[PDB]
Design a protein around this ligand. Structure first.
Ligand SMILES: CN1C(=O)C[C@@H]2CN([C@H]3CC[C@H](Nc4ncnc5[nH]cc(C6CCOCC6)c45)CC3)CC[C@@H]21
Length: 274
């Protein structure tokens, strides 16, 4: 179970929900469309407090109670709505690929383990009949050992929908059309694999192509190769393993949902790669 916190307890851990950035000397880690994230200190232990909508608060608690895995973020408690999680000292994979706030580039070696971990996390969710619905590098967090933890199960589902949710740059064509399927999570994971290989954001208005997933077509049509796109901020990449991770991403990014490999095959392929 999770700890049932009171709003005043969580207010003082966050310096009265200090909306100032940490860099200036505040408690604001970042913000999403659902709520703001705050660094909190609970008896010398560092936590992430998410002050938020109620449907997503409950869904996150419902999925977190059912799903416990090495490769998922851990929820510690809940409270105006607040969610308390284990603090991830190495933020998100998106931030680490961007070398945000002057952090060093991730090696090919670390990137491989992060992809393997991320796939184990998705495998566990699908084994437990859960579709994440928002797989992206901003939702892959990194612990003190750079272990991948899948986060944000507010949109998760245990099929069609009139309320199409998720990130546009990462979404499968059928997901954009209203279908809910674990196959769409596979597609989104392929985009994450492309971000891991290239170090490029999934969408860039200042780029050709604007969407990262479109580099698959540039490569198939022999205009460019994977070598042309490998992140130059690594010194330990080898064409063999880079090509094996690209082949997995290529397979995930198939337009026909049924032609995509299941997460068990994805997990199996990333294992063979190392
Ligand atoms: C200033 N920035 C912004 O405004 C946007 C940019 C990205 N941000 C992120 C880094 C990751 C962080 N999230 C956590 N950070 C540590 N430990 C955690 N445990 C559980 C979480 C999740 C919280 C959400 O709900 C799901 C669980 C989490 C949210 C802000 C950093 C830099 C940039």
């Amino acid at each position: 179970r999770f700890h049932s916190f009171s709003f005043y307890e969580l207010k003082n851990v966050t310096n009265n929900f200090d909306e100032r950035p940490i860099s200036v000397g505040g408690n604001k880690m970042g913000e999403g469309g659902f709520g703001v994230v705050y660094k909190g200190y609970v008896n010398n232990t560092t936590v992430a407090v998410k002050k938020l909508l109620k449907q997503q608060f409950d869904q996150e608690i419902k999925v977190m109670a059912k799903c416990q895995h090495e490769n998922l973020v851990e929820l510690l408690g809940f409270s105006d709505l607040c969610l308390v999680y284990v603090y991830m000292p190495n933020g998100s994979l998106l931030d680490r690929l961007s070398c945000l706030d002057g952090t060093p580039p991730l090696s090919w070696h670390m990137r491989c383990k992060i992809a393997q971990g991320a796939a184990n996390g998705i495998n566990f969710l699908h084994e437990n009949h859960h579709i994440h619905r928002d797989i992206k590098s901003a939702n892959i967090l990194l612990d003190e050992a750079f272990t991948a933890k899948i986060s944000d199960f507010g949109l998760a589902r245990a099929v069609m929908t009139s309320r199409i949710v998720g990130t546009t740059a990462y979404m499968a064509p059928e997901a954009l059309r209203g279908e809910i399927t674990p196959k769409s999570d596979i597609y989104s994971f392929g985009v994450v694999l492309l971000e891991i290989i290239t170090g490029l954001p999934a969408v860039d208005e200042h780029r050709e192509p604007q969407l990262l997933l479109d580099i698959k077509e540039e490569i198939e049509d022999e205009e460019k190769t994977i070598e042309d796109y490998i992140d130059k901020k690594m010194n330990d990449a080898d064409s063999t393993s880079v090509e094996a991770m690209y082949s997995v991403a290529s397979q995930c990014l198939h337009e026909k949902k049924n032609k995509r490999p299941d997460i068990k095959k994805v997990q199996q392929l990333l294992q063979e790669m190392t």
